[PDB]
Amino acid sequence: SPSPWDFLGRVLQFQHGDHKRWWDVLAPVFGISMASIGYKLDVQYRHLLVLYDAVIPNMGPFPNSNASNITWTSPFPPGPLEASVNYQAGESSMFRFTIEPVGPHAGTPADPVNELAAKQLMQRLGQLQPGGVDSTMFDHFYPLLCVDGPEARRQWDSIAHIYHKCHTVTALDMQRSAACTLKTYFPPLLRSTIMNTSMVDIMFDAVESFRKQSGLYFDYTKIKEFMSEEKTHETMMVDRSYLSFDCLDPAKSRIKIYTEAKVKTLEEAYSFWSLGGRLSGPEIDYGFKIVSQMWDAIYSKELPGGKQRENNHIQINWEMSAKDSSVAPKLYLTVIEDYDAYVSSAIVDLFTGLGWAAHVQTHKKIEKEAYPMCDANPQSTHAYVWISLAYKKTGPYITVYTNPGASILE
Amino acid sequence: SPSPWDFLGRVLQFQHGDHKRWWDVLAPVFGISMASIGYKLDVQYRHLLVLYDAVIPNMGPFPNSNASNITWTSPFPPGPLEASVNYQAGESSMFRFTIEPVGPHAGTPADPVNELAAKQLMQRLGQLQPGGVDSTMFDHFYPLLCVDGPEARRQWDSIAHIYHKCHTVTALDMQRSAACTLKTYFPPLLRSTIMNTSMVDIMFDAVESFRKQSGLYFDYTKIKEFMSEEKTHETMMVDRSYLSFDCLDPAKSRIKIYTEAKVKTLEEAYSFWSLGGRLSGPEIDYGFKIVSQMWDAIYSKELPGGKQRENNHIQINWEMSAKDSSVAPKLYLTVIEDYDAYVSSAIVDLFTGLGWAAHVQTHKKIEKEAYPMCDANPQSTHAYVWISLAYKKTGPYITVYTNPGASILE
Amino acid sequence: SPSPWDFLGRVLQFQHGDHKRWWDVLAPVFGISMASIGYKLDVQYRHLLVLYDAVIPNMGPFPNSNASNITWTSPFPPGPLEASVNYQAGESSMFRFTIEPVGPHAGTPADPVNELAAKQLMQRLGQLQPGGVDSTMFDHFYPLLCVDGPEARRQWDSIAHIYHKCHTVTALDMQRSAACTLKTYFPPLLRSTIMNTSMVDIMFDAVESFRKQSGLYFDYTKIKEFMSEEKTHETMMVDRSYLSFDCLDPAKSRIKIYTEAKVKTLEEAYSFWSLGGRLSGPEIDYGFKIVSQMWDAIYSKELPGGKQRENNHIQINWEMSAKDSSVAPKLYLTVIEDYDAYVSSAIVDLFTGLGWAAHVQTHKKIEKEAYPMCDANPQSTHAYVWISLAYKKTGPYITVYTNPGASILE
Amino acid sequence: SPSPWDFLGRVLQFQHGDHKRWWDVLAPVFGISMASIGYKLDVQYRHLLVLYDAVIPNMGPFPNSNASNITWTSPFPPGPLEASVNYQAGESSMFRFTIEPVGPHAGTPADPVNELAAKQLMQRLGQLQPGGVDSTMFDHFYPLLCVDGPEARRQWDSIAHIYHKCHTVTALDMQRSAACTLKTYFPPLLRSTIMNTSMVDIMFDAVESFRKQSGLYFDYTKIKEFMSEEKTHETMMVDRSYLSFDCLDPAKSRIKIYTEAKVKTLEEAYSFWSLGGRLSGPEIDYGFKIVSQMWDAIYSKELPGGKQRENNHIQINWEMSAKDSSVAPKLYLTVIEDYDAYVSSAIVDLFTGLGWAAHVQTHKKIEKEAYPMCDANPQSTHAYVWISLAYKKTGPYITVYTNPGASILE
Numbered sequence A, B, C, D: 001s002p003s004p005w006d007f008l009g010r011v012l013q014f015q016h017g018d019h020k021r022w023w024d025v026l027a028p029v030f031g032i033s034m035a036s037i038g039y040k041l042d043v044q045y046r047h048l049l050v051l052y053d054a055v056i057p058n059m060g061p062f063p064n065s066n067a068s069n070i071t072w073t074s075p076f077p078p079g080p081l082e083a084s085v086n087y088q089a090g091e092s093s094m095f096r097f098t099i100e101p102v103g104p105h106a107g108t109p110a111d112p113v114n115e116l117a118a119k120q121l122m123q124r125l126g127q128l129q130p131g132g133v134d135s136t137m138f139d140h141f142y143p144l145l146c147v148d149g150p151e152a153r154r155q156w157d158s159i160a161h162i163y164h165k166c167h168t169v170t171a172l173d174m175q176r177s178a179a180c181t182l183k184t185y186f187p188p189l190l191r192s193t194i195m196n197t198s199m200v201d202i203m204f205d206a207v208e209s210f211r212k213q214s215g216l217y218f219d220y221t222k223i224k225e226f227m228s229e230e231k232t233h234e235t236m237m238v239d240r241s242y243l244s245f246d247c248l249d250p251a252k253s254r255i256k257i258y259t260e261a262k263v264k265t266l267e268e269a270y271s272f273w274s275l276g277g278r279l280s281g282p283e284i285d286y287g288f289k290i291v292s293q294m295w296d297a298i299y300s301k302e303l304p305g306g307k308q309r310e311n312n313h314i315q316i317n318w319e320m321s322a323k324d325s326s327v328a329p330k331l332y333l334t335v336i337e338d339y340d341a342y343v344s345s346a347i348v349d350l351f352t353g354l355g356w357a358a359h360v361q362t363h364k365k366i367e368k369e370a371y372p373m374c375d376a377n378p379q380s381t382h383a384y385v386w387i388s389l390a391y392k393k394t395g396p397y398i399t400v401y402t403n404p405g406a407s408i409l410e
Helices: A004-011 A017-037 A041-058 A116-128 A138-145 A149-154 A189-195 A199-214 A221-227 A230-235 A266-274 A282-298 A340-354 A357-370 B004-011 B017-037 B041-058 B116-128 B138-145 B149-154 B189-195 B199-214 B221-227 B230-235 B266-274 B282-298 B340-354 B357-370 C004-011 C017-037 C041-058 C116-128 C138-145 C149-154 C189-195 C199-214 C221-227 C230-235 C266-274 C282-298 C340-354 C357-370 D004-011 D017-037 D041-058 D116-128 D138-145 D149-154 D189-195 D199-214 D221-227 D230-235 D266-274 D282-298 D340-354 D357-370
Strands: A082-087 A095-099 A169-174 A183-186 A236-246 A255-263 A312-320 A327-334 A384-392 A395-402 B082-087 B095-099 B169-174 B183-186 B236-246 B255-263 B312-320 B327-334 B384-392 B395-402 C082-087 C095-099 C169-174 C183-186 C236-246 C255-263 C312-320 C327-334 C384-392 C395-402 D082-087 D095-099 D169-174 D183-186 D236-246 D255-263 D312-320 D327-334 D384-392 D395-402
Touching (some): A004 C116, A116 A169, A116 B116, A266 A282, A312 A384, B041 D041, B082 B357, B138 B199, B189 B236, B199 B221, B221 B236, B230 B255, B230 B266, B266 B282, B357 B395, C116 C169, C149 C189, C189 C236, C221 C255, C266 C282, C266 C327, C282 C340, C282 C395, C340 C395, D017 D082, D082 D357, D189 D199, D199 D221, D221 D312, D255 D266, D282 D327, D282 D395, D327 D395
Antiparallel strands (some): A082 A095, A236 A255, B312 B327, C082 C095, C183 C236, D169 D183, D327 D384
16 A cells, blocks of 8 residues: 555656655655544545645745755745644544745745735635635735735835745645635734834734624734733734634634744743733633643753753734634744654653543654654754644643654754 | 747647647747747747746636636637737837736636736746846836735625726737837726726826826826817727836836727727827827728728628727827727728738838738638638727837637637 | 545646546546445545556547547547446456557657557556566567567558557556556557468467466467367458456466457357357356347347448457466457447346346446436437456356547547 | 746746756756857757757656665766767867666666667657658667567566666767757667677677668678677677667668777777778878877876776777778777866867867867866866767867766766
């Protein structure tokens, strides 16, 4: 038995070489993750073909060793920003991967703000499954949060200082049902920098615009209050925020506010998780229990080269539902610098404390098969990128975000 | 000796089959026109490769016999709206061809307003020649005259009644110097229909916006005055107008106002050519002499099936320069219904009256080689589409606009 | 749920347009046959991708309406000579399809005897599954039965009169286990015509060569005796014969002798089935019972246009095993001219007489889904091509050979 | 002005990535050589497109740094064995490049003797120019000198010890007239090793077979006599010989015998050049004058690393005409180990002694533009590979054979 990625790399014809290389790098990772999760073979085939047609052509050039060909500058390494494997208790794991759609010539004068890649990707996703990509929220939030090509090109003197000119990021939720639902992120840093406004008063103003235009109830009050305070900006890198929404029926879609932060103690972490105490209840408590566990399990150890932790880098997503007024957080703990060995051990011990034997097995399976550099290289710091904790009435919701192109950093 | 189109169709690899079919149909036409003009062989190769990479992928599906696959509705037949061969006295002929960039899925829910094709085409043209496609005017006139995908998708109830939802048209001026300069048309029918404004007060308001933003002097006063009158709207189909501009340095670029018209006598034709008398001088006179000659030479004859001329369909371009206040007209006489034999004979007799022996030879050469249905079928009404008369201090400027996909209508 | 053929035609990139058209035509047929048989979804994907990579590029040009582009002349219409669905009692149905591998330029001076297509196909099949295509028998029978390109090109004056210059035919047995085992046919008509020998004394001499070179026991004596008689040549078209062998381990492979025939009564049919009585036993009897049933069930009816049966066209395969001395026949009844309605009704009544309810359901399913012209057009004579009867100790073995490109003949 | 290789790499679509990489590596070299020679632009385009369609797909995988993917073993580095630029006095320079056509899977069980690549290449060359590739001599010498796939696969125990299993090598003579005439080499090492015969008695026996079959007079007597002696085998590596012939009209084609040799003094060199004195006249004298000049100009110097010359490696081609009995030699001096600086200086001083100013300029132009490692790296030993001296009644005929993939060895 050949596995779908091998057989497909053998038979498939690729428009470009960089697509072939991105395939050789990721398709193993994605396919092994999907197969260890428990996907059916035809779903592996469908999602790998989606990746081959829709995604890979909208990843950008492949990094040669000196990364000379990569003209679309970014602080993150090229490729999918992450590939995620969800872990709940009772509900089945799901594979995801978010990608900043980069065009083949983005960063160059021909496509200096990469306007088409995300739209080409949305188009391919809609064509491979008609009626699966609803652009009702995309089309409302695009003029408010995102900058078209023309604006960014005539408002260039205003943004040419920005390093990462990202304006939209697509997160595809590859489902066990072969349905690849999309999820678009809009970082308004470009738009705010052009209009000289703030991320808060633009993100949330657009959210309220969509509220009144739809009648859907997206209560952003808690989040605006918190993110508008002083001691939050004290640590918050508000310029690394973005608004996320599911490209679905706005009634059944969700909106999420995201921001980064460099905290030093669990009190600031609870500040972000809780929105300054404005969010409480049993779920906040039971969630921060696990956040604290993983905090003092991961950030309690040595970094490579014997360096010291200046601070703890975190990220946070607050999800607001359409029919409710609830806001639910999701805290990222960044481990780009940690030992993949230490991160994996922490994840495993957490899962065991939760009683998740099946999930530790799945985790180590994906680890050894898709990410061989954790077992081969005892000082690897490339596979794991973030770990995300969220708590729902179902129970915990942990989410290990790995780098699929970790084979490129080794 | 194989000629470039044959050899290229033999060696070239095409992404899609429709590209191969469009090649088989057009590349003969374009290459024969370029070769009869007097292009060099390498320029033929360069322009045919431009067509193969930039253009053909942004033409749309190829019409099967029932035209079942063509989802992007249009009153014109699919393919390039026209392929033009210029004819002056002293300056060398030039090949052109304007195309409404259609995506492979335009008209379908995945790309219901065809937003990407023109941008993809502009991108390819800029990448094949960096710094040859200046988007200074494109980026200013895009929000004013053209509708992005999102707007058109949420403002759909306002435009879903329109048959031709064209919003941008690219005219590539393939030059003897291998340089393929672009030229973008913006028909604001979508934008005006959404904003419930008029083509006049939107086109010219955008022109004045660009004036004040640039300092370049585009005197639109004559054209606004005329096109705002009553007896002009009496005949004018103002909903078939568009603003044209060369995607170049705005200093060296030109802006052109276009409108259609169904006139019955040469007095209305002089109304449009002259802007109600506001334009005069030796050039207007010497130009309308030739317009009258060709009028009573072409519209003086029988239509196929023995039908009668309800009226004479014309189009008109008024060009406004950046450094001057001059406006120069260019009158189209539509011959979509006439006998290609009669149209060719009229063109030939005109050229002979002008003393253009070389040009009648070139014309008949292109006719017999690229358009064999004029000699084979004595009742052909498909090759020729329009003839355009303009008069400059150089002399006359006649321009025969043929349909390259005339092989598809036979 | 999109079915594999639709989704694959949506995502897959095709080297050539003719591959896209062959896909649109066959992949529905093949996929519907495989799905009605009961194949798993991933096996459908694997086999359709095999068809897309290995087979389709080695089918030849796609027939336009006038079939102008088809330079490789053949009495059969272009495309797969047949697509077969096996029907046994107890063992699961299997899909097959034999194709004369035609190159993209076969019949033209560049590839006037189509030498590469079959080898390219064998190569692709071996690369998509290493060690699945054993060329031990192919490499022994190639010089004996088949003509290389050079020989056929210098021995051209000797064969240029032949209409069908076929020299090798590949029958792929797409298995429910995703394994696509090959099966090569060698019609020695070219070789015999060059060497001025007879099909009998070349086919069987090569078989004996392989016997002595291998030690495997392929008893051809019965078949040589019969096919060398006089009254068999009376009806036999010995020039339509070929030697078949499974490209596998010669120990586990089988060899088959094939010949056509135009008989008029069941006595000549029993002559061919029995090898002039030399083959007998319970199986021959029980097999000719069914041959007679289907004979007087199909050839007992009207042809289109009210024409009369000059004679009954049949074909016959005698399989010889490696470890045994048994020879087992397989009689084809050609129905290219009959009513697809009559043929389907006969097949259904036969299956019912055998008690094969599941198989009549599968048959009508494949009929209505893959071959809609049998239900739409009540006078269709294109879907069905042959029906093949063989009898093994398992029971009967009927095999309905349909034309997949029947959509092209309607 | 973009030059053809840049523009073509920008617009062209490549089936495979390795084709793109081979393009990036060679097309600069080939195009710069053709442009420095003085080719027209359209001829550059034609030949680069020939390379893109016919050749590049039949070069094999592209060498990654560890050359892990290269399964077709060879003592030479992958890519074109050489790219040649001819230099005469009076006749215009010509570009050539010989390539061992390697399939994408050659060396692996799927194509273990690489039988198709050369045939695919011949087919493409014949299709891009019908009637330009005459296979009259190819089809006669193929069974005699070359081993089909089947023979080599069943006669594997006899050849599996050979390192380089080359059996046919195509040398394309890209002409200023855009005509790419082919030239096929047959090294009978495989055939001789299978039939346990000698290269002499097989090559020359096949030549005599073609003589009697054609009536063309290819007098091989001198060459058979010499190559059959004892003191020639003393130095000759007869296992590195091959028979060459132009794939043209056998009347106008030429046959050439090739052999390698490791000589130590100019007396053995004159032995090979002269066929043991059997060849004489003014031309032999005037040719060996130049051979001696270049011998003591190149082999008179230091090797890298301060190593010593065990012996001088040479190669020799004796051309036999169809209508005459003349045999004309062509002596290769191998400089794979020498300093590209020393080799270039020797070539330049030779040309100057001949009065070839234009040619030294062309040579240094090709050097600095196509082979930058001779000027950048003062210890480069990769660009130049061989230098070939032949003398015709026109005058000298020197031929500098460079490695185009020298960019891969740096």
